[PDB]
Design brief:
The chain is mainly beta and about 170 residues long. The protein folds into two domains: about 80 residues, Crystallins (Gamma-B Crystallin, domain 1), CATH 2.60.20.10; about 90 residues, Sandwich (Gamma-B Crystallin, domain 1). Helices cover about 5% and strands about 45% of the residues. The protein has one helix and 14 strands; from the N terminus they run βββββββββαβββββ. The strands form four sheets. The chain has a four-stranded antiparallel sheet, with no helix packed on it. Strands 9-8-10-13 form a four-stranded antiparallel sheet, with no helix packed on it. The longest helix is centred in the middle third of the chain and has 5 residues. It is elongated, with a radius of gyration of 16 Å. It is classed as structural protein. Keywords: structural protein, EYE lens protein, crystallin. It forms a monomeric assembly. The entry is titled "the C18S mutant of bovine (gamma-B)-crystallin". The protein: (gamma-B) crystallin.
């Protein structure tokens, strides 16, 4: 994993490269307007300590922050997401605290509405691999990184509501 952040658009200005997690990038650069992901899967954060808007990025060139659906040009923490080989698995629930009907998911899901007739998920259990949760169908809207573990309520994956449109396994190309 290598991501290099650039302060200005079109890969110009002061830059910084990371190969690992960083809870606070503020000491390294004051703004971020373009990015070059050389390798790995990354989750970028608007605020330090992995808070605020989250953005999922894979290898590629990003000449401006709009390219990664950035809210603004603030990137203050990043996570290198560990590659998972084999099966990705998670369970979603009707109600919070793992109650109501449960469905198990093991592939990408561009529309929960379409496949489960659900617009909201009130709790989920990530058993294997890392996933990205999207507020809206077809991987649009606010993004939330799901690492393996228990999410007894939507608040646990850092969202403001239980609206869940799509789900994507964190896989490299």
């Amino acid at each position: 994993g290598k991501i290099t952040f650039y302060e200005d658009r079109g890969f110009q200005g002061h830059c910084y490269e990371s190969s690992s997690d960083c809870p606070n990038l503020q000491p390294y650069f004051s703004r971020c307007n373009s990015i070059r992901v050389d390798s790995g899967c990354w989750m970028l954060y608007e605020r330090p300590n992995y808070q605020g808007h989250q953005y999922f990025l894979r290898r590629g060139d990003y000449p401006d922050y709009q390219q990664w659906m950035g809210f603004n040009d603030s990137i203050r923490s990043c996570r290198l997401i560990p590659q998972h080989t084999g099966t990705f698995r998670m369970r979603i629930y009707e109600r919070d605290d793992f109650r109501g009907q449960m469905s198990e998911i093991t592939d990408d899901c561009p529309s929960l509405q379409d496949r489960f007739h659900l617009t909201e998920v009130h709790s989920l259990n990530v058993l294997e691999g890392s996933w990205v949760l999207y507020e809206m169908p077809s991987y649009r809207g606010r993004q939330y990184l799901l690492r393996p573990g228990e999410y007894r309520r939507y608040l646990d994956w850092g969202a403001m509501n239980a609206k869940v449109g799509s789900l994507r396994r964190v896989m490299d190309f």
